[PDB]
Design an enzyme around this catalytic site. Structure first.
Site, short mmCIF file in Angstrom:
data_model
loop_
_atom_site.label_atom_id
_atom_site.label_comp_id
_atom_site.label_asym_id
_atom_site.label_seq_id
_atom_site.Cartn_x
_atom_site.Cartn_y
_atom_site.Cartn_z
CG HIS A 189 101.57 -62.62 -17.36
ND1 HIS A 189 100.51 -63.43 -17.16
CD2 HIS A 189 101.12 -61.60 -18.12
CE1 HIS A 189 99.45 -62.95 -17.77
NE2 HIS A 189 99.79 -61.83 -18.34
CG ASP A 202 109.70 -65.57 -18.80
OD1 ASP A 202 110.40 -64.67 -19.33
OD2 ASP A 202 109.80 -65.91 -17.58
CG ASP A 248 101.66 -65.44 -14.60
OD1 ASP A 248 101.35 -64.45 -13.88
OD2 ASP A 248 101.05 -65.68 -15.71
CG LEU A 260 99.17 -55.14 -23.83
CD1 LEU A 260 100.61 -55.14 -23.44
CD2 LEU A 260 98.32 -54.29 -22.91
CB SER A 272 97.52 -61.53 -20.67
OG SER A 272 97.49 -60.69 -19.48
CG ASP A 289 112.82 -59.66 -19.49
OD1 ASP A 289 112.41 -58.50 -19.25
OD2 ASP A 289 112.15 -60.58 -20.07
CA LIG Z 1 111.33 -62.76 -19.87
#
Ligand SMILES: [Ca+2]
Ligand SMILES: [Cl-]
Length: 287
Positions: free
Chosen positions: A254, A256, A232, A13, A79, A213
């Site tokens: 994912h 986290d 996840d 990203l 990822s 979150d």
């Molecule tokens: Ca989180």
């Protein structure tokens, strides 16, 4: 115990830190450097193919190897990151000491598959369509301030589908599980391969930080949409597998596993310590 070879954190990203205001690997490079390791971060394009991210990554590494005069790098990817790392390791093995995949999309994302079907206007029950759209809007809004066009995410999620990762995997099979949900060879062409993962679990008296979150609520919704029940929120447990398994039963989503958003994770888990312990392990193998 610092590593012989520099650690390169890899994610897909590019623009995150500029748009969001803090690092993707939240708190991680700092903790690794406090521990004496040389640390770089490669931010690669979201909207490109895995192969093109791998080429960007090689250009990044060639550049830092010229200056560190260290010969090799230890990659830690999350990822989509591991796929670019796998490209460099397959192509340029003599420059790569290790590839560590953290919740990597190594065999594809069921959610990416589902989003594709939605954009193609397949007959998907509307309740599923809304769950996906709302989770993505919530994630995209949490990070960027805008929910986006749902065609915003297409260019990104395409390279994470089971189709496109399968195609990648046929070209770059190194270290992939032989058995459904197995492990790969730890060492291929001199390169060490390791994997970490996690999956959402209902256990006791969490989730603590993660209750604040919005991405965790989105992941919990997405979690319910998979045929693989251990996932996840974005990637199924078995799809993460690459090389030697270290640990994949963290009760984390994912995001986290990169200590996001802003260190809000489940069960007061110390995610940064996963990375610092792993660095010491790499150093312990003379990497
Ligand atoms: Ca989180
Ligand atoms: Cl970043």
């Amino acid at each position: 115990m610092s590593t012989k070879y520099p650690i390169v954190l890899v994610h897909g990203l590019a623009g995150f830190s500029e748009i969001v205001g803090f690092p993707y690997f939240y708190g991680i490079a700092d903790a690794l450097t406090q521990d004496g390791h040389q640390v770089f971060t490669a931010s690669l394009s979201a909207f490109n193919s895995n192969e093109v991210r791998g080429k960007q990554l090689w250009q990044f590494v060639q550049t830092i190897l010229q200056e560190t005069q260290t010969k090799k790098v230890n990659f830690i990817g999350h990822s989509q990151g591991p796929l670019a790392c796998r490209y460099v390791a397959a192509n340029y093995p003599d420059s790569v000491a290790s590839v560590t995949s953290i919740n990597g999309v190594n065999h594809g994302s069921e959610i990416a598959d589902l989003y594709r079907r939605i954009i193609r206007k397949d007959s998907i029950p509307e309740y599923i369509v809304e769950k996906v759209l709302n989770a993505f809007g919530t994630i995209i809004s949490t990070f960027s301030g805008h929910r986006g066009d749902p065609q915003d995410a297409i260019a990104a999620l395409e390279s994470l589908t089971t189709e496109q990762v399968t195609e990648f995997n046929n070209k770059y099979p190194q270290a992939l599980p032989k058995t459904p949900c197995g492990e790969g060879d730890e060492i291929v062409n001199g390169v060490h391969y390791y994997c970490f993962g996690s999956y959402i679990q209902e256990l006791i008296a969490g989730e603590n930080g993660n209750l604040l979150d919005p991405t965790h609520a989105a992941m919990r919704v997405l979690n319910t949409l998979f045929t693989e029940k251990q996932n996840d929120g974005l990637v199924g447990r078995c799809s993460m597998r690459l090389g030697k398994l270290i640990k994949d039963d963290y009760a984390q989503d994912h995001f986290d596993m990169v200590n996001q958003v802003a260190g809000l994770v489940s069960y007061n888990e110390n995610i940064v310590a996963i990375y610092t312990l792993h660095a010491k392990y790499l150093a312990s193998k003379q990497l």
